[PDB]
């Protein structure tokens, strides 16, 4: 129990918050408390949200600069270059599938013109001021002389920061040995930020408990939440079932003309380990062993690709994060236009690359995604109440894609 203690504490905090909210609503309520006591009652959760929002800027910028600078063509070769594109394409497909399923099934269900929305998206992709982008983004309103007038409004331009960090990292990659000092600087800043993040995660259970208690106090019919939350789970699992049994096998067959289910039968046992442990790092050795022995993939392919995919290629996490973003948007009565969906997909692909191969590795990336589209982050406490279940299917889908990519590259090598 010492391992995964934080996951247990998050679930216990959710239960305690539910009990606290029900007790406060029963013996009194929000009306009896009044705004004075209500605002102070939810304050620890607000402090948690402020800390999460604070660490977003350095984390995103430094990690993306390092990730872009490290894409050395020689270190990848043709095999790694093709593997990285396969990873990107399948993550994009998983994100699109999650968004589409959550829009079609509506788990959470109970303005600006189109051209102006696209133009605002383009202006935010290329911000005109790096310092302003850390706390503002461009938005267009209309004045009736309806002519559009735009200006910078409050809210961190996460998408612009992501684009700048990637482009700056590509510049550092071009400089190579000349950019070594900046590469070390941003890497060490990222490590210090990660220390801060680990400190924040220890405070997280208290903030989560009070966030849950506040939401339960505000809610009228709590029993309705569990009707939507359960539906949310379905949208996740179904997605994992479609990506893992239809989409990825179809890609493997289309590039290989071989049975993908024989490959999956060769990797069943690492998949069982991935479900049981909810960790990609724990199932990587078994995965390499089974892919080499049962599926006949050369060691120079498996021992290179699978360790990278274990960290980098996370289709399950991306599908879960997109489903969660759409589910929270539906819970909050917010409307998702094409600009917000595009932002969700892009930030989800980057965050799925950045998500960790550990239990509940995708939650902080989900917080980043929600912040990127101005969605309520306090709803995250709802999705981590069932993360012990969704995350294991996520891990299965995360390791299966690595295995199938290795098999595809092995087939290409065998044909050449």
């Amino acid at each position: 129990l010492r391992a995964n203690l934080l996951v247990l504490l998050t679930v216990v905090a959710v239960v305690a918050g539910v009990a606290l909210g029900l007790g406060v609503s029963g013996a009194g309520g929000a009306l009896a408390l009044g705004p004075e006591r209500l605002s102070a009652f939810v304050f620890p959760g607000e402090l948690l949200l402020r800390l999460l929002r604070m660490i977003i800027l350095p984390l995103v910028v430094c990690s993306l600069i390092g990730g872009a600078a490290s894409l050395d063509p020689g270190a990848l070769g043709r095999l790694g270059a093709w593997a990285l594109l396969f990873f990107l394409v399948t993550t994009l497909l998983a994100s699109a599938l999650g968004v589409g399923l959550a829009l079609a099934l509506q788990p959470g269900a109970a303005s600006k013109e189109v051209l102006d929305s696209f133009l605002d998206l383009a202006r935010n992709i290329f911000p005109s001021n790096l310092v302003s982008a850390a706390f503002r983004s461009y938005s267009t309103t209309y004045e009736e002389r309806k002519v559009p007038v735009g200006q910078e409004v409050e809210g961190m331009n996460i998408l612009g920061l992501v684009v700048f960090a990637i482009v700056f990292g590509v510049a550092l990659r071009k400089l190579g040995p000349e950019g070594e000092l900046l590469i070390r600087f941003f890497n060490s800043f990222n490590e210090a930020t990660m220390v801060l993040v680990s400190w924040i995660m220890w405070y997280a259970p208290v903030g989560i408990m009070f966030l849950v208690a506040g939401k339960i106090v505000e809610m009228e019919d709590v029993g309705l939440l569990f009707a939507r939350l359960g539906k949310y789970i379905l949208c996740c699992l179904l997605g994992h079932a479609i990506h893992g049994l239809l989409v990825l096998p179809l890609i493997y067959f289309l590039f290989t003309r071989k049975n993908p289910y024989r490959f999956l039968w060769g990797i069943v046992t690492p998949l069982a380990t991935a479900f049981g442990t909810s960790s990609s790092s724990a199932t990587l050795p078994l995965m390499m062993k089974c892919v080499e022995e049962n599926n006949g993939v050369a060691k120079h392919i498996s021992r290179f690709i699978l360790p990278i995919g274990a960290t980098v290629n996370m289709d399950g996490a991306a599908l879960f994060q997109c489903v969660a973003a759409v589910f929270i948007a539906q819970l909050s009565q917010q409307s998702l236009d094409f600009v917000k969906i595009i932002t969700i997909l892009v930030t989800a692909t980057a965050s799925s690359v950045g998500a960790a191969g550990i239990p509940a590795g995708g939650v902080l990336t989900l917080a980043i995604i929600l912040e990127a589209v101005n969605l309520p982050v306090d709803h995250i406490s709802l999705i981590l109440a069932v993360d012990w279940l969704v995350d294991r299917s996520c891990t299965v889908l995360n390791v299966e894609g690595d295995a199938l990519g290795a098999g595809l590259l092995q087939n290409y090598v065998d044909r050449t």
Partner: nanobody
Amino acid sequence: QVQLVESGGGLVQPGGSLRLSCAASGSIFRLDAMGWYRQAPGKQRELVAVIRSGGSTDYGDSVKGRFTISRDNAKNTVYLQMNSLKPEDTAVYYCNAVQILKTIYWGQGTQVTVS
């Protein structure tokens, strides 16, 4: 964090041999590739050799056949064995160690002169 220590450079005669060594010390989560690039005076940097986890290797077009990259799997060190050296091989050689999509470490560079 990784610290790269380079050794084995200097001046040599045409047709001679050198053995560069790049040793990585410290902590890296996942070392994917280790290798050498070189930059001649006035030209862009060019790949010399890579060895990746799993054993695959790659070489630059000019140095294929003569140069050989090898790994000491015990202490996470790479060796570049340069044979039949030619005046065109005079350059600054940088070793690098890469964790793909995480970070890259570049060496300070060693001058190699063939004359």
